[PDB]
Amino acid sequence: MSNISLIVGLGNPGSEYAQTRHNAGFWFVEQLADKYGITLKNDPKFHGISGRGNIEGHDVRLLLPMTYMNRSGQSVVPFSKFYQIAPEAILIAHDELDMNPGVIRLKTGGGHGGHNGLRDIVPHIGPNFHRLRIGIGHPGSKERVSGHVLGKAPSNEQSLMDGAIDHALSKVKLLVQGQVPQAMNQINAYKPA
């Protein structure tokens, strides 16, 4: 398998969305960046904030679109095309409504599952990139979905999510080194301690 060479976190720009559940992807990539000392800088050419550096012996790019969530493809697509990165070398971290806080899964392929950031990406690069689905819970009804993803989690649910993100972070070495089945097994087995 392809090594993962581009890791994307999905979310919305600005301090009012930084702590919301819909920025789970940003939390993961920001924390990865600082773990490895990768600096994320403004990258207006690609409508995002990006960085590059060594993670566990491999040269990896990191991207946070600054397009707003529903327009994420306007950053991910031209960036991946410019650097000639195939979908199979891409990991996209995002909030997943269909999984509870503290649940996290790595998935390869499939569609957007209703996720409005992935909806903007699958059409243009196809589906065969990897996803880190960070569970944020489902509020109860189709009506409350928007206020839930656009809201800040209470501290109990947030700890659960952070625990899950910390675990995936510890598996990034397998991902960048091409070890995706092993990483999938090991990420997908997580349960809160």
UniProtKB/TrEMBL annotation:
<feature type="binding site">
    <location>
        <position position="70"/>
    </location>
    <ligand>
        <name>tRNA</name>
    </ligand>
</feature>
<comment type="similarity">
    <text>Belongs to the PTH family.</text>
</comment>
<protein>
    <recommendedName>
        <fullName>Peptidyl-tRNA hydrolase</fullName>
        <ecNumber>3.1.1.29</ecNumber>
    </recommendedName>
</protein>
<feature type="active site" description="Proton acceptor">
    <location>
        <position position="22"/>
    </location>
</feature>
<dbReference type="GO" id="GO:0006515">
    <property type="term" value="P:protein quality control for misfolded or incompletely synthesized proteins"/>
</dbReference>
<comment type="function">
    <text>Hydrolyzes ribosome-free peptidyl-tRNAs (with 1 or more amino acids incorporated), which drop off the ribosome during protein synthesis, or as a result of ribosome stalling.</text>
</comment>
<dbReference type="GO" id="GO:0072344">
    <property type="term" value="P:rescue of stalled ribosome"/>
</dbReference>
<keyword id="KW-0378">Hydrolase</keyword>
<dbReference type="Pfam" id="PF01195">
    <property type="entry name" value="Pept_tRNA_hydro"/>
</dbReference>
<feature type="binding site">
    <location>
        <position position="116"/>
    </location>
    <ligand>
        <name>tRNA</name>
    </ligand>
</feature>
<keyword id="KW-0820">tRNA-binding</keyword>
<comment type="subunit">
    <text>Monomer.</text>
</comment>
<dbReference type="GO" id="GO:0004045">
    <property type="term" value="F:peptidyl-tRNA hydrolase activity"/>
</dbReference>
<dbReference type="InterPro" id="IPR001328">
    <property type="entry name" value="Pept_tRNA_hydro"/>
</dbReference>
<dbReference type="InterPro" id="IPR036416">
    <property type="entry name" value="Pept_tRNA_hydro_sf"/>
</dbReference>
<feature type="site" description="Discriminates between blocked and unblocked aminoacyl-tRNA">
    <location>
        <position position="12"/>
    </location>
</feature>
<keyword id="KW-0694">RNA-binding</keyword>
<comment type="function">
    <text>Catalyzes the release of premature peptidyl moieties from peptidyl-tRNA molecules trapped in stalled 50S ribosomal subunits, and thus maintains levels of free tRNAs and 50S ribosomes.</text>
</comment>
<dbReference type="InterPro" id="IPR018171">
    <property type="entry name" value="Pept_tRNA_hydro_CS"/>
</dbReference>
<feature type="site" description="Stabilizes the basic form of H active site to accept a proton">
    <location>
        <position position="95"/>
    </location>
</feature>
<keyword id="KW-0963">Cytoplasm</keyword>
<feature type="binding site">
    <location>
        <position position="116"/>
    </location>
    <ligand>
        <name>cytidine</name>
    </ligand>
</feature>
<feature type="binding site">
    <location>
        <position position="70"/>
    </location>
    <ligand>
        <name>cytidine</name>
    </ligand>
</feature>
<dbReference type="GO" id="GO:0000049">
    <property type="term" value="F:tRNA binding"/>
</dbReference>
<feature type="binding site">
    <location>
        <position position="68"/>
    </location>
    <ligand>
        <name>tRNA</name>
    </ligand>
</feature>
<feature type="binding site">
    <location>
        <position position="17"/>
    </location>
    <ligand>
        <name>tRNA</name>
    </ligand>
</feature>
<dbReference type="GO" id="GO:0005737">
    <property type="term" value="C:cytoplasm"/>
</dbReference>
